[PDB]
Amino acid sequence: KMYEVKERKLEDYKSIIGEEEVSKIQEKAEKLKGRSFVHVNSTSFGGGVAEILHSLVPLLRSIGIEARWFVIEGPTEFFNVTKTFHNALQGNESLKLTEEMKELYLNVNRENSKFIDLSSFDYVLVHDPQPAALIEFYEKKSPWLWRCHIDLSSPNREFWEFLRRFVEKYDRYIFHLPEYVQPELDRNKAVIMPPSIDPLSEKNVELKQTEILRILERFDVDPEKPIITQVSRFDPWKGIFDVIEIYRKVKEKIPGVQLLLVGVMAHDDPEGWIYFEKTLRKIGEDYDVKVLTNLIGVHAREVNAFQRASDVILQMSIREGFGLTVTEAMWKGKPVIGRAVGGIKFQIVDGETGFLVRDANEAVEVVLYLLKHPEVSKEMGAKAKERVRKNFIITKHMERYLDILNSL
16 A cells, blocks of 8 residues: 555666767756655556656666655555546546545545655656545645656546646646647646657567567568558557558559558457457458467567568558657667657658658558668668657656756
8 A cells, every 4th residue: 555666777778878968867867866756656567657667767766866666556446446537538428427436536545645755755756647636635845746648638528627636736747748738737837758668678679680580480471571560559540441551552563562560459458459350351361461469479579570670660540649659660760651640740750750641642652662762761760760869768758857857
């Protein structure tokens, strides 16, 4: 019940970010040495916020900051409510926020705030909705920040307004995208921090050729033939059928081209798996299209290899959040072709690091262009990797936290 986790250093990234940047990070940290920078979320297992904190906490300590991470606890009933809250904030309008739910949420947050004086720290950062209410059960005497890791583009009003009540009390609210900053909030207290990728995680670490080929062979992917790929959850707004059309049109001129539709989805995401099934029906018996998901063993390291083996990566989303899959591709020096939506529009510098397109026809022309001019593809991929290196990796992410804290 509100226990601290105790079980990665900046030096680990030296060769990746260069000394000039390592020193720059250490400098900004000077003003914060010894100070307590506490993080609070709802779990230390799985990916998401936990996966981030497992690397960020040790990383902040490696530079002199007394970073700590606490996890609140509660019965399944409390987590069923937070689960409903998540979906509701995601956009489900059928859900209703009752007085019982609000009571359980508040009640639980209150209990957890007893096994520690969170207010006794230099800086407090609460991650996501689950523990947002803690700020209500403490005598505030230092900066309190709230980090939103979810897509808050069009939340169920009644659920957001309830959360807004707690969020509004913090000194700063951090979102992934400008479009997530609800209008009720004070823009002078709103901050935009895009999610980041960790070059050393299983999804991004540079794999060796022998291991990539072993993975490709297991899933019948031929590296000696052209490969175009799109990584994303399976749903009707990710441009998946468009990608199939793009692939088919490209295949008319490049007969050996292969399409990889990659995605990892939760055991309890039926709608996701249903669209996966519809995708397979649509494709039919053209086995040059590879549908690769965790249903058949595809995990982080496999996704890693698939992106590395790709000649061109696509992200034709109609609806999208920041789009870390684009970030992942750019880090692997891959030219990306996507639609100007969500974070795709901000990450891709058209004609420079990749191409932003309106539709399938445009995408076909650009896939052929890249496939026909590998030197350009190489050029664009290199720039795309640098953009990520200087903007979207975990060390830059931590650097922005330093900038934030120092401005308080």
